[PDB]
Symmetry: C3
Subunit: 436 residues, 3 copies
């Protein structure tokens, strides 16, 4: 376990504890995203930009279909998915799993494609088709709302030639928004790591419409969405009607047993007439009594849990482990140069503060609370006095649960470090030169 | 304190010198953003999308008010003339809080004194049907309401309420609200774990108003000539002080600081130039920007700061430490400066400071126009200084340059220096090097 | 030069080989962006918002003119000839950009000669003739929005305070602008600014610009994604509020005897534990010289690596030895996640860690067993053709290297930790050990 008592003397006070949940058990829903809007109502003077748009869109979609055919021509039946590796050549584990999922989805892709004429004839933003007697499919048209709302009503008021330039500019803008996602960046269409946010760029970035039409099956939906846990996969691309069918995955957040997130709040502390701040990861994964880092920038942090669409556990150095579980002499520290570093923090109703670097006094007696040059921070609680003042704040305090003699015992301190990108190279160079 | 001559001979030519300023002394203005639009003029056949959007917005806005109530329930005015007589904090009922979070809590209570008065206007705030509205708060005070989706409704849906089928207007609306929510979730969604703090930029806040912060700031007022600055450096910040789940409108206190230039504090930029040594090209690895204040030399993490032509602007004192060896290197101990071998052919090879030209004439062909002959660099000179004493007009490829006179040593080009050890700065190189030294130590 | 057989043993399965091509030989074209719309049709409800927008845009554009005028005032014919005394601080890129700016003034004079024509444009794209032979296109920022929404609605409503909507539209446009042409912009001289960023003055619609300019290359998408198509500001006008941009359209020139090799990572067992090796995913080989590349800046395709600049960086000598057969110098990292790839296929040949994923090939009708001394188990049609892993049944080809692959062992490198705090902790521990 983490020893929070010695960690608070270093400047790391306990924060919230959070439960770790990962994406798992994903359901499947199939939708149709039509990249080319229906322009039947505006075709009388749509100009020649429709053909140019079609050619440009082929220029984008053709590599996607080409990369899909590599798996399309290598999946068949021999019971289950039967792969042929000679004609594949280069593929990762994720690519092979995506190919198996692709062949699975081909069974419903055939039935969806059986309604090609219905798919092409769609002229609403969200259209319902009866793909079979007991199941339906939704069709989303990329720019159909724009055409029905702005361009179609203004087909005779504004100059149509101007309408021709408008429609064009709209197409262009849609293509420009697409190309960040569906352009040559999409080297591997056989993948399910692509978020619904990116796929919705084929619909104007409006993933809310897609998901709401599909259905908010779970109460953890927002955490799934922000974590981009709702992923998708392209399973069929048509170069004749310019549509792609996407199998959206709707998973459930599975609480990982015997696992939690611990967050530590850094507090600047005083040592040798200077301010220092200790460098440890702000967040720690503890799973089955094993301590390991957690790339968190990708995860989503809530007040009670940390939601990750992948298991982002990353290794911890033994030295960092020891530092977190008591050996504070191994905890590195960096000198403070920012006038705006945190100086106090509230944990469990009790305050740990550096009262030599900040104004520090008590409300119930009016007297100042003095910090010596030997001690790093102060535990202020109702025992010393039940209300403290730190500049403009007046704070009533609660009891402490740890040692009664917290402020009368000192600890050892670690070595100074510098965490700049260039500082790493210089320290390596000097250490190498020192060794030589 | 920086010795420019040895830096130049290594390849760190002089750059511009800029002052250091920080956000300071923030004035406050209070506004409200109604995250729900008034659909009264087009409510005839809006359908049920209004209710569903209501529930979705309630679901998103509920955690914000839940986090705010942790401070609201626990904030109170301490009694009697003994202390500054401000706000008391039920710290045991708060549990977990940082210095910045508590500070924001205090500013939240402070703003409550005005937020109660603005909440008296609840019926007026509901009645707003324009994208910007001004309201009287008192006979000597005013407040602004911004409608999240009023411009779109009033410009497209109301005029086109009959020319198209009403069902189509239903979809369009639904799509518009869903687009709003999708743009919103990046800021006001579950990413917003701490709404109490005031570190959130006005650009992020404007996402609740369609990303149009320029309207927020213009309507409030261009208080100073530095306006673009406090804007880009993320110095203009706002705080949510009251969330209402019945009218779906939040009150935001916008902060307009003033930029205090720090005295005895300037930012120096160094230009790197590839230099020849041991029959190969190298580039030194030093910070491009260095902060020297109170004769003290420290780095700066300028990525979050704004580098204008004359000053470096930061919404926070972003000064960071610098290694002792880097201080000695920038002081003159030039052998402690690291250098990186360059394999790219697109690294700059010459630079101009004070009108004197530093160049690597081994890598790039140099000749002088006045004498019509080549400018030669020998194998033991890292860089060649060219100035009017050398010749008043030299060329480097396709550029004709006229040079001024040097201010330092007259015999610059005849004096050599020591050179440091090579380094490699790839992400995997650091791990590879650390293993090598560890194995060497064992 | 890369020993792929030995790299497979450490988890680096050989992947796709791609061809390296860099930006070179840029053509030049001239466009004019007028960053304020012409509203002569809706001058009725333009109200006063336009004067405030004029002031705001003048304040925005003044530093750009100031930072161009340093080279405007200090360059003259004496080819291109420049005054370095009054310029003072300048980089190689800045000097080259100023030279190109001077070359562009020759056409900039003729372009400015049509100032009245430029300011009279009332569409998003209008064709103008600067000479008897050459033509120029002019792009106005919000003319489409105006002509499609505000113009029709001006008689479809009693103005309904159109100001409120025009003001907001111009405000949103300026909010979009401030990210690129706002304070951030410090060196408008340099030509490293991408056409995507330039199009923010036109609403981010770079596709219209590139289509109207008439691209005529098959590498157009690779040019656009790799940030190869850049622009340069050559003149600013504060009276009509338009700027001239010289768009550079380059061509992809393949670097001879150069290719980039991709390594696919696969977890491997060692000492009853699972590791992943820390080696760059993409490796550039040029004339039998091996160097790294920050491939995040470039674009990766199925058959080529496209960068707008030569992004080669040096590699440690030890890493070079690691990638050339001596596997003991290759660092490895412990795998504390359950979502690391565990198998990969190379040349129809499967590499997998059968300890961590169950293997039972259907042709033999039995499980595939990996000992406690084999990092990866290699399967091909020589052992049994079709293998099954989890839910995939895959048929396999034949290996081309050593037939005795599974029987030979190798040495393994030392563990590493790649977190930034881990690096600092390792540095501190090594320093303390030295002391």
């Amino acid at each position: 376990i983490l020893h929070y008592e010695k960690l608070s003397k270093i400047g790391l006070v306990k924060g919230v504890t959070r439960k770790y949940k990962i994406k798992s058990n994903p359901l499947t829903k199939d939708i149709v995203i039509k990249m080319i809007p229906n322009v039947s109502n505006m075709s009388q003077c749509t100009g020649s930009v429709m053909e140019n748009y079609k050619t440009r869109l082929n220029g984008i979609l053709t590599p996607i279909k080409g990369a899909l055919e590599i798996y399309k021509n290598n999946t068949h039946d021999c019971a289950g998915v039967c792969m042929a590796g000679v004609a594949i050549g280069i593929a990762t584990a994720a690519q092979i799993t995506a190919g198996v999922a692709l062949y699975e989805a081909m069974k419903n892709a055939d039935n969806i494609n059986k309604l090609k004429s219905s798919i092409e004839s769609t002229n609403e933003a969200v259209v319902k088709l009866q793909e079979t007697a007991e199941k339906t499919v939704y069709v989303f048209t990329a720019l159909q709302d724009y055409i029905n709302t702005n361009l179609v009503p203004t087909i005779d008021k504004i100059p149509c030639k101007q309408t021709e330039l408008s429609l064009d500019l709209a197409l262009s803008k849609y293509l420009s928004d697409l190309l960040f996602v569906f352009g040559p960046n999409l080297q591997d269409p056989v993948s399910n790591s692509m978020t619904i946010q990116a796929i919705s760029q084929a619909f104007g970035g409006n993933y809310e419409t897609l998901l709401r039409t599909l259905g908010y099956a779970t109460e953890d939906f927002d955490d799934l969405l922000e974590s981009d846990s709702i992923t998708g996969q392209i399973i069929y691309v048509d170069l004749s009607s310019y549509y792609i069918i996407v199998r959206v995955y709707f998973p459930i957040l599975t609480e990982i047993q015997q696992a939690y997130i611990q967050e530590l709040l850094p507090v600047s502390f005083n040592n040798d007439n200077s301010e220092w701040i200790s460098i440890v990861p702000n967040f720690i994964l503890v799973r089955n009594t094993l301590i390991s880092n957690i790339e968190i920038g990708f995860c989503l942090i809530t007040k009670r849990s940390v939601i990750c669409n992948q298991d982002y556990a990353t290794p911890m150095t033994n030295n960092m482990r020891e530092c977190l579980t008591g050996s504070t002499e191994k905890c590195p520290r960096e000198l403070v140069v920012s006038s705006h570093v945190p100086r106090f923090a509230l944990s469990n109703g009790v305050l740990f503060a550096n009262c030599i670097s900040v104004t520090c006094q008590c409300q119930t007696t009016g007297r100042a609370i003095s910090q010596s040059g030997e001690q790093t921070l102060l535990m202020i609680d109702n025992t010393t006095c039940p209300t403290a003042v730190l500049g403009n704040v007046i704070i009533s305090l609660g009891k402490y649960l740890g040692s009664v003699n917290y402020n009368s015992e000192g600890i050892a301190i670690g070595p100074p470090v510098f965490t700049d990108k260039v500082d790493i190279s210089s320290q390596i160079s000097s250490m190498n030169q020192s060794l030589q």
